[PDB]
């Protein structure tokens, strides 16, 4: 594919006329990669107009798929394009990337067939430190800083030392501090993926929030409420809202079949419910402790040979639909052991 | 559309800067005191201090330094505001008329560049040739000190080190050199760079990068014959000159990190030190070359922001949180040890976290009670018109909230004290505070190192004698937020409702909170109703005999039953986290820290809350108040005030649910709380009365006005700017305009009382120059606007 | 982990012919082994992602399953009997190297081979 270097960015709140692709229906996140393939000659014609212009095309955030109604949308840039003449007809492959959020003013459809939209660029307001407006001239040098529990305790007391001057305390501003908030998302991100925050996760607060917006299952409505955000602090807060509202535990392959819930999560191990658990070969799997779990079949027999939990036999528990290795069904051998039967599902299969 | 008047009733008292030199005369020693926007001039005397001239400036003072270049007999003062305005001033006195003049004026703000963590560092070369200002990370501004440089030309030189902790100018050098400590992935190093005016580029210094302490924060310039710079961190006081390096680690400075420093001797032998715990230390230099550095404790003073040495052991403590003290030091006389003696105590109201207008003795004239100071400097202040009399009540603990009960005749004050962790397993107070010094103590019902632990207490203080009668100690890991004193339901007794929240180091969001109820009768405090809720209780308000409490984001209302218990009625969920609550009649105001205003009204027919109008704009919010049914006063980021008006006569649903931002004004002060009423005795051309307390101690009043009064005052403002000379030649239209790091907007729907009232102070020809389209007819109108405060 | 592509069921390069030995290897050998109860974890290739076995393909360079053998005999991929015979043999051996004796999954593989060996002993000569 033919690569591009140029980066185009329109002015804030300035009204711009940008065409909308009809094939694109899904809501776009700023900076998100989109693999498109357009067959229609008039659709390939719009792309041919963009490359010579500025490669910036509009993607509507459709509130209702029926009436095609969309109050918001995101601008997408064509960084790569390829024109392959396959079996006789002209086909184009377009790689899109989000640039700026926008408010839809008016939807006007041309006599040619394609549709255009009156676009107003949403201001990406980036607020700095909350302490910046109240920090004393003497404590200014203490702001720079050279076991994870100890760090955050010292981080709060030092950066937010001027909290006594305001009506609100130290810990209150932590709920609004980007660095503190980013760590809360990182915590639950580790509860699903083994990837370290050093390389897989970005450092910039605005960019980091946008990546999360896609992974976590968010229906159009949540995605719109997620885009109405024009500031980093409003984005991470909303990501925490999703983490504290949709606890629905499913299978990573099924995505629809329910395994268990947050209510059934019980603390047996002293680390909590889930910690690192290695079987005979050398696999590091984080095993969840739950009372009851639905949609799980029992294959073979429960063997007591190398059991993580003390004196429990592990039956090979699998899903009823995809047949993925979800975890185990630990049963008590002795009559004086409780919980008698509880599920030992690994993180890798848990959603 | 809004039309409002904002006048400074009380000037800010918190000292931000204090330097000693020769401003008025070359022979007379002068002390300059900076109080946020106000400037004070004093002549150093053996008895104390003498006042000569006090001038108001149109900018938040951040940089203030005295220097003497060649040709000039007396020292010139350099002032840099928060609005980035460089100005050089000199004292002028002929017969009786005093007029401070500006030799050079100009702006030093750049269109590109992010503000640094340390902010602005103001340092001027000892030989008085150049001014060094670190405004942004990695960028260094150099402004020359010449007679030709009147417009103040500035150039930014690219520096390799982004994160700079503290920068100062070196002594005993031909070319100007800057010494600084930077942070990098390796640790912390001290580096020097030589400045050249010709090349306009940085060059190699007198010595290479040397390794220092991991917590090295302060850098002090050392004059001749010693030379070099002293670097003090948290544990030790290091010395550098090149090949020469001296290190001493005192255990007495380990208790609290030194934040401020001052030079005593003209050669560099004695140095005043001030930590976070208000302790006063002395840095002694032994002797061309240094023999050894000695650190000695003097005593206990106010939490110093900046120290200054005057004459004959008289030291002026510049405190932002506590009272400014003129303390005497006993360094001399080997017979008796080092002891500090306070001589004069300057009243400091800053900071103000909670305030109330309560009639105590007058029953007509409003008397304001403020929760001033922090930590050991935390004290109660009673303000009334005399001139304004201030009555101080020490607490020795951080005050949070205040409430009044006319039935029990006492004040309910929230307090937070610091208690260090014990080796065996417990806590012990640093010094006896109002809570431990109380007549009677009480504890709540329980459920289920070397670290400072914050413990909360509910204080009961008298309204005439001001004595700590009762103190209610709060549970472990519990933080108090809201406290209201009002009658609930059909109950005739007046209760104190507490909106506590459980804070844990591991729990970022508070998942636990209590709604404790207290009654005060026969000089005894008692627990009435305990209501545990899943979340934090930030703010509470009374709604027609019912208690409204906010749990995280949700807004809840409680009914007061005959069983003396709190009962849930209806829950109103919200997208944003509820933090600010204000009410009048039926209208309820909701606000967060991200400046997302939301108006709700309790519909009693359906038995719930209906969303009326909402305004979403991202900014750091701090304080809010309802002016009327449509107008509401709010305080946001970068020391500004805003007013948003709704329209009940809007033809479209989208218009009436939208709030129009009609109010824009830069106060130059940070407001944390708002309360109704007036300090004066109760035919006013001003509508309503809203008083406010700030971080620096500046107390003012916000009041609505009519359409005619606004235009009459607005046109007076543009004329007064022409006659009144601005201190530093900085525009009033630029200073009062809405300021933010991303945008600048003009002031609308606001009238500055500071410029209107100045018409009485200025002379008669300047009075006649404004009224000319009447001179004495306008005076009576200005005099009407002075009576209100 | 990455799942490698399934083995080629139909290929134009490799020669193929319809013999009576392959007819018996589909209607008698395959059918009986397919209708058995312990045949379900072999009716498809052992998935490295579903069962979470990433080092499975790192050891087993030649993986096979009955599902591949069923399509190969139906689409006619083998020339002689030995090519179809080698496919069944590799199938069982792969699990024997990976899964240690005593496992429930080992017991099924062995149960199918006993029924496989009794039928392959009755394999006729080419017509
Ligand atoms: Zn599944």
Q: Which domains does chain B have, with CATH numbers?
A: 1-14+349-704 (2.130.10.10), 15-348 (2.130.10.10), 705-789 (1.10.150.910)
Nearest residue in A to B637, CA atom: A133
Q: Pairing relation of β-strands B279-285 and B293-300?
A: antiparallel
Q: Judged by CB atoms within 8 Å, which residues 169-198 of B form the interface with A?
A: 183, 187-188
Interchain contact, B305 vs A140, CB within 8 Å:
no
Ligand 1 centroid – CA B765 distance (Å)? 89
B225-253 burial, b at 16+ Cβ within 10 Å, e below that, comes to: ebbbbbbbbeebbbbbbeeeebeeebeeb
| CB-nearest partner of B620 from A133, A136, A180 | A133
Q: Which residues of A are annotated as a binding site for (S)-thalidomide?
A: 306, 308, 314
Q: Pairing relation of β-strands B4-10 and B751-752?
A: parallel
Distance from CA of B11 to the nearest CA of A (A): 18
Interchain contact, A146 vs B187, CB within 8 Å:
yes
Number of CB atoms found within 10 A of residue B51's CB: 9
A249: which residues sit within 8 A by CB, 6+ positions away? A258, A259, A260, A261, A262, A350, A351
Distance from CA of A323 to the nearest CA of C (A): 7
Q: Does residue B708 sit in helix, strand or coil?
A: helix
User: CB–CB of B715/B403 below 8 Å?
Assistant: no
Ligand 1 centroid – CA B677 distance (Å)? 65
Strand order in the sheet with B61-67: B61-67, B76-81, B85-90, B101-107
Nearest residue in A to B575, CA atom: A238
Task: Give dist(CA B30, CA B25) in Å, integer.
Answer: 8
- Residue in the block written with tokens 């459920």: B447
Q: Please work out, in degrees rounded to the nearest 5, the angle formed at the alpha carbon of residue A241 by the alpha carbons of A235 and A246.
A: 130
Nearest residue in C to A322, CA atom: C50
Interchain contact, A138 vs B259, CB within 8 Å:
yes
User: CB–CB of A27/A62 below 8 Å?
Assistant: yes
| CB-nearest partner of A325 from C50, C55, C103 | C50
* Experiment type: X-ray
User: CB–CB of B350/B12 below 8 Å?
Assistant: yes
Angle between helices A205-215 and A178-189 in degrees, nearest 10:
30
Instruction: Check if A298 contacts C (Cβ < 8 Å).
Output: no
Burial of A99 (0-12, 13-18, 19+ CB in 10 A): buried
Written as six digits, the tokens of B509 are 């969001």
A67: which residues sit within 8 A by CB, 6+ positions away? none
Q: Judged by CB atoms within 8 Å, which residues 289-318 of B form the interface with A?
A: 305-306
Task: Give dist(CA B573, CA B552) in Å, integer.
Answer: 10
Burial of B172 (0-12, 13-18, 19+ CB in 10 A): middle
CA proximity to B126, closest of B182, B47, B179: B179
What is the homologous superfamily of the domain C19-123 according to CATH?
Answer: Bromodomain-like (1.20.920.10)
Q: Please work out, in degrees rounded to the nearest 5, the angle formed at the alpha carbon of residue A228 by the alpha carbons of A225 and A232.
A: 105
Rg (CA), chain C: 15
Task: Give dist(CA B357, CA B680) in Å, integer.
Answer: 10
A249-258 burial, b at 16+ Cβ within 10 Å, e below that, comes to: bbbbbbeebe
User: CB–CB of B327/B345 below 8 Å?
Assistant: no
Nearest residue in C to A346, CA atom: C52
**CA-based torsion, A219, A224, A230, A231: positive or negative:** negative
Resolution in A: 6.3
Interchain contact, C51 vs A325, CB within 8 Å:
yes
Look at domain A247-351 and name its CATH class. mainly beta
Contact residues, chain A to chain B, C-beta under 8 Å: 125, 127-130, 132-144, 146, 149, 152-153, 164-169, 171-176, 180, 184, 225, 230-231, 233-234, 237, 240, 244
**CA-based torsion, B89, B92, B98, B103: positive or negative:** negative
Q: Does residue A218 sit in helix, strand or coil?
A: coil
What is the homologous superfamily of the domain A1-122 according to CATH?
Answer: LON domain-like (2.30.130.40)
Can you give the residue ranges of every domain in chain A? 1-122, 177-246, 247-351
CB pairs under 8 A between A and C: 24
Residues with CB under 5 A from ligand 1 (ion): A 251, 254, 257, 319, 322
Distance from CA of B64 to the nearest CA of A (A): 12
Task: Give dist(CA B524, CA B518) in Å, integer.
Answer: 10
Residue B150 backbone phi and psi in degrees, to 5? -90, -35
| CB-nearest partner of B320 from A136, A152, A171 | A136
CA proximity to B441, closest of B404, B478, B415: B415
For residue A221, the chain B residues in CB contact (below 8 A) are: none
- Residue in the block written with tokens 């030709």: B148
Instruction: Check if A301 contacts C (Cβ < 8 Å).
Output: yes
Burial of B491 (0-12, 13-18, 19+ CB in 10 A): middle
Question: In sequence order, what DSSP letters do the residues of A130-174 get, joined into one string?
Answer: SGGGT--TTGGGGG-----HHHHHHHHHHHTGGGGGSSS-HHHHH
Q: Which residues of A are annotated as a binding site for Zn(2+)?
A: 251, 254, 319, 322
Interchain contact, A127 vs B622, CB within 8 Å:
no
Chains within contact range of chain B (3+ C-beta pairs < 8 Å): A
User: CB–CB of B701/B678 below 8 Å?
Assistant: yes
Strand order in the sheet with B218-221: B218-221, B229-232, B237-240, B245-248
User: CB–CB of A147/A169 below 8 Å?
Assistant: no
| CB-nearest partner of A141 from B17, B166, B622 | B166
Task: Give dist(CA B132, CA A277) in Å, integer.
Answer: 59
Residue B197 backbone phi and psi in degrees, to 5? -70, -30
Ligand 1 centroid – CA A215 distance (Å)? 18
Number of CB atoms found within 10 A of residue B180's CB: 23
Q: What is the end-to-end Cα distance of chain C in Å, rounded?
A: 47
Whether cis (ω within 30° of 0) applies to the bond prior to B225 is yes
Task: Give dist(CA B286, CA B268) in Å, integer.
Answer: 10
Question: In sequence order, what DSSP letters do the residues of B153-218 get, joined into one string?
Answer: --EEEE-S-S-EEEEEE-SS-SS-EEEEEEEETTEEEEEEEEE-TTT-SEEE-SS--EE--TT--E
Interchain contact, B618 vs A233, CB within 8 Å:
yes
Interchain contact, A316 vs C55, CB within 8 Å:
no
Interchain contact, A299 vs C104, CB within 8 Å:
yes
Cα B545 to the chain's mean position, in Å? Answer: 36
The size of chain C, in residues, is 127
**Per-residue CA distances from B777 to A18, B153, B350, B722, B774 (Å):** 61, 46, 38, 21, 5
| CB-nearest partner of B183 from A142, A144, A169 | A144
Task: Give dist(CA B673, CA A166) in Å, integer.
Answer: 9
Number of CB atoms found within 10 A of residue C80's CB: 13
Rg (CA), chain A: 26
Task: Give dist(CA B135, CA B113) in Å, integer.
Answer: 9
Does domain A177-246 fall under CATH 1.10.3720.10? My reply is no
Interchain contact, A322 vs C52, CB within 8 Å:
no
Cα A131 to the chain's mean position, in Å? Answer: 28
Task: Give dist(CA B67, CA B88) in Å, integer.
Answer: 10
């Amino acid at each position: 594919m033919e690569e591009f270097h140029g980066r185009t960015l329109h002015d804030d709140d300035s009204c711009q006329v940008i065409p909308v692709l009809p094939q694109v229906m899904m809501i776009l996140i700023p900076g998100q990669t989109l693999p498109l393939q357009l067959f229609h000659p008039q659709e390939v014609s719009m792309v041919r107009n963009l490359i010579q212009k500025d490669r910036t095309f509009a993607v509507l955030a459709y509130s209702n798929v029926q009436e095609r109604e969309a109050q918001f949308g995101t601008t997408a840039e064509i960084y790569a394009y390829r024109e392959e003449q396959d079996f006789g007809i002209e086909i184009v492959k377009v790689k899109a990337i989000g640039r700026q959020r926008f408010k839809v003013l008016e939807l006007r459809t041309q006599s040619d067939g394609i549709q255009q939209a009156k676009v107003q660029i949403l201001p990406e307001c980036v607020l700095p430190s909350t302490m910046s407006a109240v920090q004393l001239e003497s404590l200014n040098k203490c702001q720079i800083f050279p076991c994870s529990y100890k760090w955050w305790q010292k981080y709060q007391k030092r950066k937010f030392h001027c909290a006594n001057l305001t009506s609100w305390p130290r810990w209150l501003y932590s709920l609004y501090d980007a660095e503190t908030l980013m760590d809360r998302i990182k915590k639950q991100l580790r509860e699903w993926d083994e990837n370290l925050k050093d390389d897989s996760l970005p450092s910039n607060p605005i960019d980091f929030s946008y990546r999360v917006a896609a992974c976590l299952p968010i229906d159009d409505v949540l995605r719109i409420q997620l885009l109405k955000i024009g500031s980093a602090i409003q984005r991470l807060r909303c990501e925490l809202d999703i983490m504290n509202k949709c606890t629905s535990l499913c299978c990573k392959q099924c995505q629809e079949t329910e395994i268990t819930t947050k209510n059934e999560i019980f603390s047996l191990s002293l680390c909590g419910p889930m910690a690192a658990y290695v079987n005979p070969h050398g696999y590091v799997h984080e095993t969840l402790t739950v009372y009851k779990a639905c949609n799980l079949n029992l294959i073979g027999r429960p063997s007591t040979e190398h059991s993580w939990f003390p004196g429990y036999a592990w039956t090979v528990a699998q899903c009823k639909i995809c047949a993925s290795h979800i975890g185990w069904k630990f049963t008590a051998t002795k009559k004086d052991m409780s919980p008698q039967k509880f599920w030992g599902l690994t993180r890798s299969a848990l959603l | 559309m809004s039309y409002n008047y904002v006048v400074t009733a009380q000037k800010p008292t918190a000292v931000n800067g204090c330097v000693t030199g020769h401003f008025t005369s070359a022979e007379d020693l002068n002390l300059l005191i900076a109080k946020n926007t106000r400037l004070e001039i004093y002549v150093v005397t053996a008895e104390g201090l003498r006042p000569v001239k006090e001038v108001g400036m149109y900018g938040k003072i951040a940089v203030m330094e005295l220097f003497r270049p060649k040709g000039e007999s007396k020292d010139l003062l350099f002032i840099l505001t928060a609005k980035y305005n460089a100005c050089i001033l000199e004292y002028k006195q002929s017969g009786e008329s005093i007029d401070i003049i500006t030799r050079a004026h100009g702006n030093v703000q750049d269109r590109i560049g992010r503000p640094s963590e340390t902010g602005i560092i103001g340092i001027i070369d000892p030989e008085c040739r150049m001014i060094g200002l670190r405004l942004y990370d990695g960028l260094f501004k150099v402004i020359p000190l010449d007679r030709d440089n009147k417009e103040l030309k500035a150039f930014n030189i690219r520096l390799e080190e982004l994160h700079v902790i503290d920068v100062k100018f070196l002594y005993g050098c031909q070319a100007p050199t800057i010494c600084f400590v930077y942070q990098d992935p390796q640790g912390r190093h001290v580096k020097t760079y030589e400045v050249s005016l010709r090349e306009k580029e940085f060059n190699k210094g007198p010595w290479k990068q040397e390794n220092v302490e991991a917590e090295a924060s302060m850098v002090i310039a050392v004059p001749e014959p010693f030379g070099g710079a002293i670097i003090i961190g948290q544990e030790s006081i290091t010395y550098h000159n090149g090949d020469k390096y001296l290190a001493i680690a005192p255990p007495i400075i380990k208790q609290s990190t030194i934040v401020c420093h001052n030079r005593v001797d003209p050669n560099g032998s004695r140095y005043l030190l001030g930590d976070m715990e208000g302790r006063l230390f002395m840095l002694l230099l032994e002797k061309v070359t240094l023999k050894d550095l000695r650190v000695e404790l003097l005593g206990e003073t106010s939490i110093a922001e900046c120290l200054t040495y005057l004459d004959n052991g008289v030291v002026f403590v510049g405190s932002r949180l506590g009272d400014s003290q003129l303390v005497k030091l006993n360094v001399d006389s080997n017979e008796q040890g080092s002891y500090v003696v306070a001589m004069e105590t300057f009243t400091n109201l800053g900071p103000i976290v909670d305030m109330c207008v309560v009639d105590l003795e007058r029953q007509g004239q409003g008397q304001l009670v403020t929760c001033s100071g922090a930590f050991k400097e935390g004290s109660l202040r009673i303000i009334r018109n005399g001139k304004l009399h201030i009555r101080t009540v020490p607490l020795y603990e951080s005050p949070r909230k205040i409430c009044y009960q006319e039935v029990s005749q006492c004040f309910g004050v929230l307090s937070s004290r610091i208690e260090v962790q014990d080796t065996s397993g417990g806590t012990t107070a640093l010094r006896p505070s109002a809570s431990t010094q109380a007549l009677s103590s009480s504890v709540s019902s329980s459920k289920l190192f070397g670290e400072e632990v914050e413990v909360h207490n509910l204080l009961i203080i008298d309204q005439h004698t001001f004595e700590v009668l009762h103190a209610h100690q709060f549970l472990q890991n519990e933080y108090a937020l809201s406290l209201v004193s009002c009658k609930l339901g059909k109950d005739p007794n007046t209760y104190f409702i507490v909106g506590t929240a459980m804070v844990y180091p591991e729990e970022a969001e508070p998942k636990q909170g209590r709604i404790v109820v207290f009654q005060y009768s026969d000089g005894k405090l008692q627990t009435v109703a305990e209501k545990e809720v899943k979340g934090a209780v930030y703010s509470m308000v009374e709604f027609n005999g019912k208690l409204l409490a906010s749990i995280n984001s949700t807004v809840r209302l409680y009914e007061w039953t005959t069983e003396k218990e709190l009962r849930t009625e209806c829950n109103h969920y919200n997208n944003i986290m509820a933090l600010y609550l204000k009410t009048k009649g039926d209208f309820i105001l909701v606000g967060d820290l991200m400046r997302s205003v939301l108006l709700l009204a309790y519909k009693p027919m359906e038995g719930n809350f209906e969303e009326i109008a909402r305004d979403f704009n991202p900014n750091w919010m701090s304080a809010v108040e309802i002016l009327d049914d449509d107008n509401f006063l709010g305080a946001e980021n970068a020391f500004n005030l805003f007013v948003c008006q709704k329209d009940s006569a809007a033809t479209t649903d989208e218009e009436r649910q939208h709030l129009q931002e009609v109010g824009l004004f830069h106060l130059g002060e940070f407001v944390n709380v708002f309360c109704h009423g007036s300090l004066v005795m109760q035919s006013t051309p001003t509508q309503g009365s809203v008083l406010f307390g700030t971080v620096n101690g500046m107390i003012g009043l916000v009041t609505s006005l009519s359409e005619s009064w606004y235009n009459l005052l607005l046109d007076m403002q543009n004329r007064l700017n022409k006659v009144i000379k601005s201190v530093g030649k900085i525009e009033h239209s630029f200073w009062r305009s809405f300021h933010t790091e991303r945008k600048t907007e003009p002031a609308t729907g606001f009238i500055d009382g500071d410029l209107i009232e100045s018409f009485l102070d200025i002379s008669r020809p300047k009075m006649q120059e404004v009224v000319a389209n009447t001179a004495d007819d306008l005076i009576k109108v200005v005099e009407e606007l002075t009576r209100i405060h | 982990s990455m799942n490698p592509p399934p083995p080629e069921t139909s290929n134009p390069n490799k020669p193929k012919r319809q013999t009576n030995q392959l007819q018996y290897l589909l209607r008698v050998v395959l059918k009986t082994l397919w209708k058995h109860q312990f045949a379900w974890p072999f009716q498809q290739p052992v998935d490295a992602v579903k069962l979470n076995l990433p080092d499975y393909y790192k050891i087993i360079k030649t993986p096979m399953d009955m599902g591949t053998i069923k399509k190969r005999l139906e689409n006619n991929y083998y020339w002689n009997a030995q090519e179809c015979i080698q496919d069944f043999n590799t199938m069982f051996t792969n699990c024997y190297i990976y899964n240690k004796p005593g496992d429930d999954i080992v017991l099924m593989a062995e149960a199918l081979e006993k029924l496989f060996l009794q039928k392959i002993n009755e394999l006729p000569t080419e017509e």
